[PDB]
Each structure stands twice: as structure tokens, then as C-alpha cells.
Amino acid sequence: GVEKVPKYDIPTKKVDYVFIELDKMKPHAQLVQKELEAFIESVTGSGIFWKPMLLAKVPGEDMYLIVDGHHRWAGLQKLGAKRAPSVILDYFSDDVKVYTWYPAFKGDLNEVVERLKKEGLEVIEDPEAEEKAERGEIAFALVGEKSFAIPGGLEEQKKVSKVLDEMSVEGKIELIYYGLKEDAREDMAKGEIDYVFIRKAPTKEEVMELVKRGEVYSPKTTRHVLPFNPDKIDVKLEELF
Numbered sequence: 001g002v003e004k005v006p007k008y009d010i011p012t013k014k015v016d017y018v019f020i021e022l023d024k025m026k027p028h029a030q031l032v033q034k035e036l037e038a039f040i041e042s043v044t045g046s047g048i049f050w051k052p053m054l055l056a057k058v059p060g061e062d063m064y065l066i067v068d069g070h071h072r073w074a075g076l077q078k079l080g081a082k083r084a085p086s087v088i089l090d091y092f093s094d095d096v097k098v099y100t101w102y103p104a105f106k107g108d109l110n111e112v113v114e115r116l117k118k119e120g121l122e123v124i125e126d127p128e129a130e131e132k133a134e135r136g137e138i139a140f141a142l143v144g145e146k147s148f149a150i151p152g153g154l155e156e157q158k159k160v161s162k163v164l165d166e167m168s169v170e171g172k173i174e175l176i177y178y179g180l181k182e183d184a185r186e187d188m189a190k191g192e193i194d195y196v197f198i199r200k201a202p203t204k205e206e207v208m209e210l211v212k213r214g215e216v217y218s219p220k221t222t223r224h225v226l227p228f229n230p231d232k233i234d235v236k237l238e239e240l241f
């Protein structure tokens, strides 16, 4: 997939799954095309669905927030499947923590910036872009050798994400999402990526608030972390219809 594997593997737990209908699931985020395609090819090719979705009950509604699993959800619906193996979490428990994923690329800075500016974004050279972005003052900081501020909020975050999605589909960049910006910096020094986009993470209150209004975030906005990762499950794709 598009995400960088964590440098430390947290403990696994054999939590088991329950089938939940895909049309009872509510997205809070947009999709990355390469992440969707990779899941569809993996599950159809292998015949096995091995990672349960993470869900939480939406307050006041007979629906579940997709905590983690937007591409599995979209991909399965696209394939015509009806349900997915799921884990129902207590969203406001202190055992659900939320951070973010940082978009990153190996590719030409100048072509990326040009495409961002063509979409109407401002990309302003700014040595304090990173800390502005961590404070939530700008949409993203574009940081590597150079440092740029991208002003705005959610709409600009969507615009940025869309440019990267398109450039990724066109083969002009390799698009990778990092859980930790320090991992991105380490890979920069190895030459494995050139630039990373820094953003402040949402809070759990903001996520549910946003979903209750029927809105979505830009892709990979939340990185939810539990005290464990569920163990691999062994569900046939045919069992999801």
C-alpha cells in the first residue's frame, strides 16, 4: 500500500471480527487511488481478506464511523461485496489515540509546486512553515531541502491531496504516507523521498463532529492507534458477499 510500515511493531492481539454491512459504514476521509487499486488487486488476487476494519458507533445514528478502512470499504463496495470483517471500538476511550499521516513524495519539487499553483494553491517559501503547520495555522508545510508554507485549511488540504493523487496516478511521483515525520526525515537522508507535507493532526472530537455534518477530510487525515494491532484474520473474499 501507500503507507510506510512503522519502524516499531506494537503488540498483536487476536481480537477476532464481526461482519458489519458496508452500507452501515460512514467514511470520514477521501481516497488515494493507488491505495484503492492495490487493495482491490490484493484481495481479488489472493482471495483472502486478512485485516479487519476498525469501526465505532456514531452517536445518535444506526451507522458506524470508519475509524480505519476507507479503501477496504470503497474497494469491497466496488467489487459488489456486502459486508466486511470488523472490530467495533469505543471511540472516546483513552485506548483510541489519534495522530495523522504525512503525504510524501520522491519526485521533482518544481513539477509538484507548479501543479499545486495551477490548482489555485499558494506555495510560499517560509522557514517557519513546519511549526506553523504543527500549530494548525496553515494547510500544510512542504518541507525537505527547502521549506514552503501552503496557507489555508481543509479545502486547501483536499486540493493538495488531489494534486498528489493525480501526479501519483500519472507516474510522475511515488506517493508515500508516513506516520512519523522523523521517519520521513530519515528516509530523506537516504534519498528514499525528497519532500514531506506536515499537518497538525485532528482530535477525536473534531472527527466525529465532522462526520455528523456529513463532511469528509482529505485522505489519511487520521492515524488511529490502539494498544495493539489486530492479528491477521483468514476470511475468504467470497464470504463477504
Ligand SMILES: Nc1ncnc2c1ncn2[C@@H]1O[C@H](COP(=O)(O)O)[C@@H](O)[C@H]1O
Binding pocket: 001, 035, 038, 039, 042, 043, 046, 048, 049, 050, 051, 068, 069, 070, 071, 072, 073
Ligand atoms: N487482501 C487484503 N485483505 C485485507 N486488507 C488488505 C489486503 N491487502 C491489503 N490490505 C490492507 O488494506 C488497507 C487499505 O487501506 P484502508 O482500507 O483505507 O485502511 C491497508 O491497511 C492494507 O494493509
Ligand SMILES: [Mg+2]
Binding pocket: 068, 069, 070
Ligand atoms: Mg488504513
